[PDB]
Specification:
Chains A, B: This is 6-O-methyltransferase 2. Two copies of one chain form a homodimer. Chain A has 314 residues and is of the alpha/beta class. Helices cover 43% and strands 16% of the residues of chain A.
């Protein structure tokens, strides 16, 4: 019947959901309703908008679309139509760790969407970003905040048996202090790599010695060879008996039914367009770790986009 | 669990599906595979691409995404991985009426997507198109081709009982000749309206007399008042006893489970951004027809995005 054609129409207009979600975030609808403490009429909503004079017909149509997306609700209460929050809209309310406002605003920004229009030129023998265009660190600082919190709470035993840990690329050290606070017996050292402000083997040849090296979202930015060199340096830095490397990064499984499978594939494409990196399958991680001369590995799933790869070098 | 958060991530990256579909169309993947007559290996596919030197890793990742979208297929045949067409991909193969290549290329064009980024400024008291940017008529000529074909085949009886018909805005008359050919006893007259190349009542005051007036995708571009004036002129043009108006246009029902509900809502938003028109609910059509002094109406669903409103003026 129409189901296959509708599948195509829904793919064609998929950008509408992204850009109506952006509008809902730019209008701060979720927080207006949340701060009000109860559902709101259209005119009540319209008065609190950071805009000035408001087209209420157009707001009504935006609200209708958002209700159909099941992000907001519409109810007849006392013969008046009132707008509320659907459960998913909780991730649009500010003031808690899982708030997604920053991610939405960064990803749906027009300039950061622009490379995706150049996906084709990206298949013909330069990053799509340059062809497209010639801060949001909170979206990353927050992301690294949810990852660390998951590590401590969901699979804390990966930090068992060690007394020292080096976090490569942790910058100021915000991330690794979750470890330092949950495990005060672990001496945590942050280590940023020396890099040119204008290869991998020399950039990594003086990693501080520690029982374990942690690399959160590092290796997805490097090709297989440079990753092998990185892993070899890390192997040099850890003790023979109980030393290990902790990689945090996506494990791609297109056969998975996990709710995040789709977005993980999408982020692989985004890495292709913007950085030239990739997200690796379990098999790719296996071959890369074995090719580094490591002895074993173990993947742990956490309630995050990334997974955890424990890699044992000896 | 993660299902609500995944709902949000899938909304955020909804534009990825649109723009990977565009890439698949720009690469002509569906027709390469179709013309080959059987599934193809990555290197076989890569050789036939209108590109020149081809990044095969990047093509592989695009193909992986397209297979996960269930538009293309991947199979191990003779220990070799071969890419084929999933059923929906039939609408990507050229050479038949329901081919959607033109629609995909027009809608996902970057400049025609640009207004959607200005949805917010569109809620503050000018069409988003001007704020965004300061042929595809085949997508319309084809669309009007599928509508006419549906009219004749699915609800042909709407043209029963008449011997004359005027098609307002049919241009050259391609559309109304489906009627003229299926119903040779119906004298069909096309009538384009006089318009300024730089209101509605004078623009419509000399519609040719006929048993019936047909308006395909006209009224969604006019506000309620101008539509009422239009309908009054049309009422003047048709006979008292068996005269009628035939409107073809979306009937919006957000409560519907029809596969096209979502895209119909989206097109209402698109009309808001680009033209300032709207798509009307059944109740809005009812109130507008009754407000025009008409006596009745009847909605017929067809296998098209638009529905059919028979409006009886006497």
């Amino acid at each position: 019947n129409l189901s296959s054609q509708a599948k195509l129409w829904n793919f064609i207009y998929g950008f509408a959901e992204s850009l109506v979600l952006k509008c809902a975030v730019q209008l701060d609808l979720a927080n207006i309703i949340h701060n009000n403490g109860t559902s709101m009429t259209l005119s009540e909503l319209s008065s609190r908008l950071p805009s000035q004079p408001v087209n209420e017909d157009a707001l009504y149509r935006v609200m209708r679309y958002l209700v159909h997306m099941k992000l907001f609700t519409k109810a007849s209460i006392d013969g008046e139509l009132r707008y509320g929050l659907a459960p998913p809209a909780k991730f649009l309310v500010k003031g808690w760790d899982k708030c997604m406002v920053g991610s939405i605003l960064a990803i749906t920004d027009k300039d950061f969407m622009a490379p995706w229009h150049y996906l084709k030129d990206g298949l013909a023998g330069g990053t799509a970003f340059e062809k497209a265009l010639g801060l949001f660190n909170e979206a990353m600082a927050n992301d690294s905040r949810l990852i660390m919190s998951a590590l401590v709470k969901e699979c804390g035993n990966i930090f068992n048996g060690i007394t020292t840990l080096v976090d490569v690329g942790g910058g100021t050290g915000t991330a690794v202090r979750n470890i330092a606070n949950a495990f005060p017996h672990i001496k945590c050292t942050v280590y940023d790599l020396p890099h040119v402000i204008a290869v991998a083997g020399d950039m990594f040849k003086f990693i501080p010695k520690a029982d374990a090296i942690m690399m959160k979202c590092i290796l997805h930015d490097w090709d297989d060879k440079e990753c092998i060199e990185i892993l070899k340096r890390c192997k040099e830095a850890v003790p023979i008996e109980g030393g290990k490397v902790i990689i945090v990064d996506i494990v791609l499984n297109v056969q998975s039914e996990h709710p995040y499978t789709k977005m993980r594939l999408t982020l692989d494409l985004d890495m292709m367009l913007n950085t030239g990196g990739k997200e690796r399958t379990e098999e790719e991680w296996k071959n890369l770790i074995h090719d580094a001369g490591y002895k074993g590995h173990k993947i742990t799933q956490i309630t995050a986009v990334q997974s955890v790869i424990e890699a044992y070098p000896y």
